[PDB]
Design a protein around this ligand. Structure first.
Ligand SMILES: Nc1ncnc2c1ncn2[C@@H]1O[C@H](COP(=O)(O)OP(=O)(O)OP(=O)(O)O)[C@@H](O)[C@H]1O
Ligand SMILES: Nc1ncnc2c1ncn2[C@@H]1O[C@H](COP(=O)(O)OP(=O)(O)OP(=O)(O)O)[C@@H](O)[C@H]1O
Ligand SMILES: [Zn+2]
Ligand SMILES: [Zn+2]
Ligand SMILES: [Zn+2]
Lengths: 217, 222
């Protein structure tokens, strides 16, 4: 249809700043508890509120025009799609001023970390199995996977794993679980991305305008 | 690492009945409602309480010994793993008497369904993209995919997709969203599975004991 589709995180760490950025680019809308879609009141724009993990896929499959997502989630999902034999593509428009975090290897507080080789043959729990797999291959370290979507930091205490690969900024969660960060494998921020296949002149024009305004802020 | 590990859904449509099946089979336990780990108080068993989507991976990777999971989630993740060039493997111990649901192609109620080839070219929203992909390749209908983890039934109303492939039980939600069920592609129930690699003799003996009890419990509940 005529309206531009912009996917953002429904509720989590990027939601507040995604909405703030959209407001500053002249997109007026009301966010309440709409399950999926919020309609801009001043421009022909639909805001899709989704789980963050779905946003790369929506961009790859051409379902939405624009997307605001963390680079970690984007790349996790690109790698998955590549390992399926697919050719995911997207246009990067801008790296943004929020969503700063890093994906790091971590061990229990009372361990003797000398070297990356100390991870050899360990069981490593993570929500980012593709990112971890690529890092370990690149550095020639063999390991055992444990994929968990939540409570990753509880995995060593639960005896499910010897170590974790998790997102960190402040270190507070690691500290709470008596773990210590030992090696960063990936640095991330929020980015604005666009699908591959060409937008309408109507829609592309509207994107260029928002983009002009994005640069402004 | 010698306590038997069993993964179950932490909170959701299988969580209550998984815990109750365990109690019915004589596994006494205390649960702290927000926590990943719980322990049997009378048997050497850890109960790991996780997101259901993680259970098949945990079994395939040998991280736990047993799991209770919907057949739909098991199959979707098996297909995913196979399409990634992996070799996911598990033992099916038992099909269980709860978790009944079905995965169904569905269209707006105000919409003429003559034929399964009506889906040709349609954008289809789903949480089960591998299961959809297999069914559509098998039947020869081409389509465009839209993967959504939740709110799938709202996608047509939101003009993200023309049709959905949706998990339903009662069938009430679809009516609520002004959509009609036109073709079942998968029928699911809860199952009990075990990892591929052999358990120690003592742990396999505990599993054999649990299995006899599950069969008796299931007889008694008819
Ligand atoms: N401590 C942090 N500070 C800033 N940004 C973070 C931090 N941790 C994670 N992020 C970024 O924000 C994104 C969303 O984080 P959040 O914890 O809300 O994800 P989620 O729980 O997977 O969300 P959803 O419910 O949509 O699945 C992460 O993928 C990452 O890009
Ligand atoms: N009416 C139903 N709709 C969806 N799933 C159902 C239904 N009835 C039974 N189930 C079963 O319950 C499983 C759990 O789905 P649930 O609705 O609890 O939410 P979820 O988001 O999958 O849970 P989690 O938070 O663990 O990811 C399904 O995958 C399926 O096997
Ligand atoms: Zn309002
Ligand atoms: Zn997420
Ligand atoms: Zn789930």
């Amino acid at each position: 249809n005529t309206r531009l589709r912009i996917a953002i995180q429904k509720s989590g760490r990027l939601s507040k700043e995604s909405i703030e950025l959209l407001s500053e680019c002249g997109v007026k809308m009301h966010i309440h508890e709409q399950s999926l879609i919020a309609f801009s009141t001043n421009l022909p724009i639909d805001i899709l509120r989704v789980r963050d993990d779905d946003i790369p896929g929506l961009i790859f499959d051409g379902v939405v025009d624009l997307g605001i997502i963390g680079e970690n989630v984007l790349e996790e999902n690109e790698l998955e799609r590549q390992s399926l034999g697919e050719n995911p593509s997207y246009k990067l428009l801008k790296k943004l001023d929020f969503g700063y975090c890093r994906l790091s290897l971590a061990l229990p507080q009372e361990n003797k970390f000398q070297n990356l080789k100390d991870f050899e043959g360990l069981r490593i729990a993570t929500s980012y199995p593709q990112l971890l797999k690529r890092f370990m291959k690149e550095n020639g370290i063999n390991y055992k996977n444990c994929t968990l979507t939540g409570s990753v930091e509880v995995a060593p205490r639960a005896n499910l794993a010897d170590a974790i690969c998790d997102l960190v900024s402040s270190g507070a969660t690691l500290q709470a679980n008596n773990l210590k960060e030992v090696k960063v494998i990936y640095e991330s921020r929020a980015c604005l991305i666009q699908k591959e296949n060409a937008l309408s002149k109507e829609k592309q024009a509207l994107v260029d305008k928002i983009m002009l305004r994005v640069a402004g802020v």
